[PDB]
Design a protein around this nucleic acid. Sequence first.
RNA 1: CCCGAU
Lengths: 44, 58, 58, 138, 64, 76, 50, 463, 1044
Amino acid sequence: MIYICGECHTENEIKSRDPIRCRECGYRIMYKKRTKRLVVFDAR
Amino acid sequence: QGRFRGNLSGKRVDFSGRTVISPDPNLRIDEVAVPVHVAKILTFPEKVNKANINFLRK
Amino acid sequence: VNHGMSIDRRHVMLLSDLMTYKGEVLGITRFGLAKMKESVLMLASFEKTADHLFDAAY
Amino acid sequence: IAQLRPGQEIDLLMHCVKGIGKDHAKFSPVATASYRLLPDITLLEPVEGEAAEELSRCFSPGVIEVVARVANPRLDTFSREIFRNEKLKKVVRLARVRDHYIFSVESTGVLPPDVLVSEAIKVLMGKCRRFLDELDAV
Amino acid sequence: MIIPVRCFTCGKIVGNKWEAYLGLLQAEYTEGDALDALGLKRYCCRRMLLAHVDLIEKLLNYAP
Amino acid sequence: RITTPYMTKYERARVLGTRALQIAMCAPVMVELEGETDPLLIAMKELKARKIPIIIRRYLPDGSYEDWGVDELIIT
Amino acid sequence: IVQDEILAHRLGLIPIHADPRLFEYRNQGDEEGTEIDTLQFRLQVRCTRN
Amino acid sequence: QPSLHKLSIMAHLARVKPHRTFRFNECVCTPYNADFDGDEMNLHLPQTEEAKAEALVLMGTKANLVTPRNGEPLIAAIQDFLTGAYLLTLKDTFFDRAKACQIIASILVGKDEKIKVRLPPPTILKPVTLWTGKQIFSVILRPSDDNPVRANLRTKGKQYCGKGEDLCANDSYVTIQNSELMSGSMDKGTLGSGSKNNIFYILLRDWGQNEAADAMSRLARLAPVYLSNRGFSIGIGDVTPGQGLLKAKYELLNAGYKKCDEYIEALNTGKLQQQPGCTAEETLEALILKELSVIRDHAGSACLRELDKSNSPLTMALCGSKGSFINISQMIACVGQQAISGSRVPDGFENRSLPHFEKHSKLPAAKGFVANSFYSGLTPTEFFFHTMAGREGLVDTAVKTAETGYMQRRLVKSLEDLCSQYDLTVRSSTGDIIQFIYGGDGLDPAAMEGKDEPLEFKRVLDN
Amino acid sequence: VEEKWRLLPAFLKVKGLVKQHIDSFNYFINVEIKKIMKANEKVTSDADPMWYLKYLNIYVGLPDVEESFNVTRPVSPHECRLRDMTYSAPITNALPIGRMPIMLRSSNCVLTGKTPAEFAKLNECPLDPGGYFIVKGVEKVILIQEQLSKNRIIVEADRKGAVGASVTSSTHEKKSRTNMAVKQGRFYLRHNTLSEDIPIVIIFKAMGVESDQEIVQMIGTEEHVMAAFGPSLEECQKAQIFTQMQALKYIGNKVRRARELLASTILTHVPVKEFNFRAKCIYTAVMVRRVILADRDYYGNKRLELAGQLLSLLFEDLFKKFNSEMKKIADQVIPFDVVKHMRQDQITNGMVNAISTGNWSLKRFKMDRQGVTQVLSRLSYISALGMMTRISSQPRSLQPSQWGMLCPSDTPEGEACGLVKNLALMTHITTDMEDGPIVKLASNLGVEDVNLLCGEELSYPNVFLVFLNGNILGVIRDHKKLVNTFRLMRRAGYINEFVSISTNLTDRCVYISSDGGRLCRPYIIVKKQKPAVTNKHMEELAQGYRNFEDFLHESLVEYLDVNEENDCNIALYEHTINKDTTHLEIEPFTLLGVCAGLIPYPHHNQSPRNTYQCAMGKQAMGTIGYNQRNRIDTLMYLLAYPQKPMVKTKTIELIEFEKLPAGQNATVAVMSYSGYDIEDALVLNKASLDRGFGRCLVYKNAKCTLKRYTNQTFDKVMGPMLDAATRKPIWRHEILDADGICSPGEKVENKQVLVNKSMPTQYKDVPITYKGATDSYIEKVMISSNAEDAFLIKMLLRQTRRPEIGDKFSSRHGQKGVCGLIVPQEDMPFCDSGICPDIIMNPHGFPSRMTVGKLIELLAGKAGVLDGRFHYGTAFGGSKVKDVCEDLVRHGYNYLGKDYVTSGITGEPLEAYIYFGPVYYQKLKHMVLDKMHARARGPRAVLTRQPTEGRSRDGGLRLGEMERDCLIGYGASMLLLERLMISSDAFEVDVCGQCGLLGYSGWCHYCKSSCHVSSLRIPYACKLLFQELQSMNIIPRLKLSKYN
RNA sequence: CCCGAU
Ligand SMILES: [Mg+2]
Ligand SMILES: [Zn+2]
Ligand SMILES: [Zn+2]
Ligand SMILES: [Zn+2]
């Protein structure tokens, strides 16, 4: 599990039941990394 | 809101849908164009009566 | 006819003849329905649902 | 295609297919493929004496000569400014030839426009030979 | 957002005429004859540059 | 014998109402039908051929009645 | 920051100089392509600071 | 969902199309009171086979073509079809066998594809041969050869010529003989909803209801195919006043203002005669309104004289498709006095309508008169008074439906349990007689002809 | 004379739009919290009188948030929008009291002063109005309420001339309504504490003026109708021998449910008395004076209570509840901060709960104003700015006193056709002030009261009596000197600019109003026929070498409220200046709001067609802010390629609407085509929609939070259940990503699971699934703690919809239209130069609606694109047609715009010319995918067993009782049994023959004999009627019969 | 309850 900070944008490997703070920040808005699967789109 | 004026007379109804309307002059005055997705949901129980046996099997 | 709005007289010949057929002119209010109808649920589906149901149980 | 800021990626494969333009307009081989009938403008009355240069600025610029002569009619956009003049509108009838038009093909660049037209005729002929072979079956 | 790469009515390729248009407006070129330099004859392909706003340089600021 | 000899629109509706529901329960059909699978479309073929096994019981509001065969009526 | 479909739609409107009538139509669904029907393109852009 | 009359629920046959909108023919939209501006409407589906026939027979559109208030037809052409068929049956149109077989062959789909459509012989033969417009409108009433419809109708029209029965050059006098339009042009009053002498009402009574619904579903297919290839279009050239209006409106605004300056001055400075209604400063305003409505209607007549034919809002007003001649005078010439609930606008400030005018000013353009038309654009005081008079329309529809919704409810909660019994008497639910025959004659108001008479014998004998 | 419009962009920088929300709150923070401490110092208790708690000051700091013991970190407002917190700052020896939320762009918010570069790191849009609190994550506005004035002698017409002054106690504890009635020709003083309509001369003798000569001298010395005060009451007073002052308190001393010297202070309050009642008598006498000489909706009477005035109604009450509970504690533990820190819950969860649930439930002021706050509508940009300038009422018709203050055309329709107004551009609501220098100049300029003989203030012309804020302050012989001298003084700047002196000559009362809450507006002063702006001033403002507030002190611009506008001669333009002009008008397009004003040429349309757009302008679908991608809101509509309009107005530039527009501008060609455009419908083409004309972006939002319970167990987000392989469920846990939360950048079908929120009862999983109808792609997934730190997780679902059949477009003139048909491009009437249209519009929308302003946008737009220019069509001005039309001629076009087309289908040219050009078509948020609905057979409601209400709950739409009568009138009997018993409530019940009552199943419990019990067939709702009738004592005893 | 649709 790798999450991206609010504005620091550092990948922070947290685990479960862990506060969502950040390395090099304290900001608690952590988005998730984009998926790894082949996503098919239609140009219509 | 009570049972008389809203649950005994004006009661909600199954097999009923609601969309936005748009014109179609290419229909006869007696016909409404119904979308496919609605027409696959609203169903009519047609009993099987020796004339719609092959039609309902199909 | 003052407001445009043409109408058959046979509709007004019915509304007047209902309104005055039990003796006196019975205006179509909540009160005139009690003097027009005998059945309770037709009165009870109209206004004053509380009193019309208890009084017809009395 | 898109704009980026540092740390951002775009990674994608594409698939191209052969599509009719009426399926979706991204398959359209031509920007505009319109046509217009060639106009011809006949001065019924001879015009001269400063009404000619009045009729010059009335039309499209290149169309006219100055007496008044309708020098080259093909360049006329139909502003229809004559009818604002109230004097020359009785003088000249404006008209367009029916069986003489002007095509104007401008390709997007897939095929050169002299091969777009010769393909356009080629599939109309194929659309009617597709039907003439239906009657040969029946 | 970003410049739509077609005209909506005719479909002239107009997405490649944005930074070439902004490069013209950086110079003296008036709003009118800048689009005559890019080969935009009819007005429907002319409004795709004229009436367009470029939010994508502004959204990028708020997208680290 | 005293009511209207015209089949009203409320009698044509219910005669087509119940002859449709009868023929949708495998009733015997009277019109040697030609591929109509909607039971309602069979019933209008029954009405126009004037073969419907139904007698309308018309109630005068005093309580007396007056029968009327659907053969014996003037449809529109 | 450009959305996925709007990117995928804006890749659609780009014309492609490979002429047709070398290729044929896509018969089935056939999302794999058969190199007689399709023509693949790659786009890999990752920007940094200079 | 705001069901206001019997025609808001109607049955329809259902054809599964490819979209998510409920699409119906636009002739049946005035019974629903349904425009297509984002309106939604519900679709119930009856389950038992008995409730399927009760929808089809009683509530079908082929049965309820006619509203039960008057007997008028509600399902008839709206908007474009009326202004399509007026522009087609107008005297000037002529089609060659190119366009004639193209407009006619539009009417060949969907129960109509199996008829040998008979083009009538053309009405010009020798110098060029070509059809006329009205001869193609006759193909709507009788497309085949073996069609049994012979429609007959003779009536007046809008912009009626006044003198002359059918022979005057204005040509607003319809005469159909045996479903062939012989003279006249199809107005709203000969095709639309509300008139008891349009053809779809005449085809209903005389020839069954299947031929009226077919001839109405023929016109809805035919008239756009003509109009989309004829190109009826509005523009701002259709709103600009010519030269003749401006010199007419300028004098009418001056000579209409000299007198109202004197009629005000004849009141306060001296002695003014009084109308019998009230005192001064009440009949002054009623004499102001007479001279201002002189202005907006003479300029409204100055507009209509110079307005060239084939003007688009004029053509939409001759046939009554959309907007009368009042709207053309408002758009072009001059929109008149803006009235609030039947008077000049009341002073919201002290003795003054807006603080731009003077105190106790009874002047025009200070108590609600707007001088500029919508083309030349309203001015800020004029735009405010038009807004003030405009909101009384919007406010009253909010409060009327708050009352007539209740008045619909009290009415139907007393009057619901009456039905004309089989011995022609109309009784209550309890057996008590209200009427001995329904309405004296026992006659449907729905089937009733105009004048509250079932026949109108002049029409039937000529038919 | 040429350029005076420049005063408006200088006014908007200072105090114009959404700055009246802010200044009102900035007054509330920086003044009103220090005027409640002066009212509520000295917390004393009786159980110990030797201690005292005395507040010195309250400071309200910067917004902060703690997540632990003492981190105390600050917050940006677009973090509270994500973490569902509440953007608030602490309230404060020097110890905290509570926390109060701060509206954005306030004096203590973070966003003020900072550059657009710093708005990025705070993740906030610079083109964002502010004036909205962020409470519990959502963003609420306090809507401007309008109340009637305070202590106003209103002369109504209940039966004949009743007058009631709704006095509001400056000591705000109560608000009483001491109205005065006339019964059979006699005056009375009805109150709500009085048990009897007592005659007024009873009051007058109770008020100290005992003799009857004085009372008439008060009411009328000139007798002509005030003699008919005589045999009314002072005879009726004298008819019972009751001439005595003490005895006439005694009749009051009975009915008031010696003891009434005090209780006459709770009657006509704000006239002050120190047991010298002479000031009270004249104010009652003037109230009688009106009646014998004898507008509720007129905007000199309507004062507006803003967001900062309305919070001071709350915080004073919440401070008192904090205050009185200190007395309840100090009287509990004495027979002190440490018993106060738990009352940080009192203010904070008191203030926040009043904004989120919009309820001032204040029993202390007896007011229960419901729905004061509203969630912001972030549909477009102007649907946010159209909420900031909004006024809710407590009549429907437009009054002309709203000229210049409110928008005439911006209103809803329906329930609120004239009850929800919108502020215009150049307005300003006033704040309160002190009344010191107003009185100090009043008593110098000449006034005298309480020494003047009763007779003076009467029909004599030179007795204009000065009234300030509703309290009489003397009488002046010469009204003109007073009105003129105050006005010169205000212009000079000695008196506050906002105060207004107005004079009513019908009743001689001048009216100095320093009320605060008055609707105000600026005008250019016209001394003699030359105005005061002088152009050169309009040039100073050009370089900035001067500011709009320098115009005020130079006596060039005057603020006028509605009351002063009775006394002025406002000239609209320069050329309408008269001999007695008084004030002039700055820029006359400012009478329109901000939702109208967007319209080009509103002065050419019929006026009920601008009003349709003011609703649809808020419904537009466009861009929201520059932070529109970082916002995770519940429903956010975005356009793919917005375009600024070709015909802009002038209000569009001041709002900077073109900086973030809404809607494209498509080349329409108004003509009738194919008959699929009949009732306002409009044909699009299937090439522009393939080229991206108005592609939608509808962004939903699903969320969950994982709370730790009191059981000390918590929620889990355990990953997918792989079955027989690493592959996840058949499609159910396919997008989960193995951390629980679904993966961003992936599509979600129907009934696919977003998170596995599992709950402790032992774990029952409550999977948060995405319902929808169509698929949606995850764009962002945010993970945070809320205030009570419980791991909230927020999704964000893309969806793009090309506009297909059904999708409502409007046309910037209120001519909205569902897109009836989408033809291919090659079937569409191309003109000569090749331009096929996008949106064929029907020409029948024009001659009935008379929207001529649309017909000029096809002209001003078409000349605009051809010249490379944006044509101003503002209100009451802009580019005229006689110069636009001669610009088409230079580019070789028709001078009306009607271009010769040839038809696409048949190939021959069209018989008539077709109007043609670009007009601004804005797509709006009524797309048919959100409204397509059908219910075959689904959930029934648990109580009444009918189908549920709503499409979110799988629907069923109410065949109402109005449609019951339609089904009655057709005579369809068997339909109604099918439609209201068979397919709604198909129930089956058992009753018995004898004693007929509902007995369950096979036998009836009453009379156990089981033999008579015979089943019925009934709707369930009727069975629930019988069973709830029988619950009370009404017993429907059914008596069955067999089918005959 | 608000909002919004008609
Ligand atoms: Mg509507
Ligand atoms: Zn960080
Ligand atoms: Zn183009
Ligand atoms: Zn029993």
